[PDB]
A and B are shown apart, each in its own frame.
Chain A
């Protein structure tokens, strides 16, 4: 029936004709090469260097499972041509994710901003939600660092993903997101550390933030 063969390539398991008339091979290659990137992702996003790279790596697996969820769900045994047409509006999107990753690659803020410029570059198209759901979780740990100088003041660093590292007492060297708040965060923290010794509209960040800076 061959349908359980082609459908078992998007999963990665080899088959009788998938190793690692007569025109079907051309049709087979169009769904075959789709599989070669799915495997080329688990080989790349399997680990649990950088903290923000892990979250982006942890956000990617939150997506592939959906791709594994959609398959093995609808078709018990459908027509051969139905497979190629059904997995076209979705398959080409999988090949787009290869242009994003490698299959070098920035880290830290350099990556949290690179992924941002991928939004405005391809905003209105159908690639807006998937990239957004990545950026929405690829910045999750970075907000926590920012959530230190605003609430507690205990600077937290691991490998240098933060853009800021650590008489005069003011030698915490400092030198995308709106610079109107960039330099303000640098001073909104040093004050706390000193009292201890005595459309892309970024509104979800600055609104719970500026309310605390003035106070």
Chain B
């Protein structure tokens, strides 16, 4: 279920890792090939994946309309890249050593555990208040004063791309 886990973390659930459109990723039931008090960490690890899918389900649908919103989407694709990069790194590890345990990935994947919940609610405000127009430039900036250095440096990048639209329309007009 090692390789089964990584695929579930990429957006492809299975039988052992069921999917729900309401709750999200979750362990189905008890299995005899897993420790009785181990299912805990997997559910906590699955919460990292549940955020990831709702990203893609939002990205693919692009849903509200406007260039600033659409360009904010592509800006969201850049920040998720190290998550794609770091997860792929584990593949080289287990192919090398096949006896690794489930504890190591949690020790490796702690940094992304904190970045998503702060940036995920930023998407929720947009889908719940219909933030249409240039006002998206402030909702990203209002959370840009956050305390977490990584969360600050992440939304910093989206702002560096979201302004890429304003500067163009500003230039072609002024």
Contacts and interface: CB of A to CB of B under 8 A. Distances in A.
Interface string B13-27: 111110000000000
Contact of A124 (B3, B4, B7, B164): B164
A21 B12 contact: no
Nearest to A29: B12
A185 interface: no
B88 A79 contact: yes
Q: What class of interface size applies to chain A in its complex with B?
A: 20 to 34
Given A92-B60, A124-B67, A27 B172 contact: no
B13 A26 contact: yes
Interface stretch (A6-14, A56-64, A81-89, A144-152): A81-89
Interface in A98-143: 122-126
A23 B12 contact: yes
Contacts of A85: 10, 84, 88
A57 to B, nearest CB: 28
B29 interface: no
B110 interface: no
Contacts of B91: 79, 81-82
Given A85-B88, A92-B60, A123-B67, A23 B14 contact: yes
Contacts, number: 58
Contacts of B12: 23-24, 26-27, 30
A122 B171 contact: no
A199 B16 CA distance: 51
A92 to B, nearest CB: 7
Interface string B158-169: 000000110010
A82 B10 CA distance: 11
B74 interface: yes
A22 B70 contact: no
Contact of A126 (B74, B84, B88, B172): B74
Nearest to A121: B67
Contact of B6 (A22, A81, A199): A81
Contacts of A92: 60
A123 B168 contact: yes
Contacts of A22: 14-15
Contacts of A23: 4, 7-8, 12-15, 17
Interface in A14-40: 21-24, 26-27, 30
Interface string A61-95: 00000000000000000010110110001001000
A202 B89 CA distance: 48
Contacts of B164: 124
Nearest to B162: A124
A85 to B, nearest CB: 5
25 contacts: A21-B3, A21-B4, A21-B16, A22-B15, A23-B7, A23-B8, A23-B12, A23-B17, A24-B7, A24-B12, A26-B12, A26-B13, A27-B7, A27-B10, A85-B84, A85-B88, A89-B77, A123-B67, A123-B168, A124-B71, A124-B164, A125-B70, A199-B168, A199-B172, A201-B172
Nearest to A201: B172
Given A81-B91, A85-B84, A122 B7 contact: no
Given A21-B3, A89-B77, A124-B71, 5 more contacts: A21-B16, A22-B14, A26-B14, A79-B95, A125-B71
Contacts of A84: 10
Contacts of A27: 7, 10, 12
B41 to A, nearest CB: 20
Nearest to B74: A125
B7 A81 contact: yes
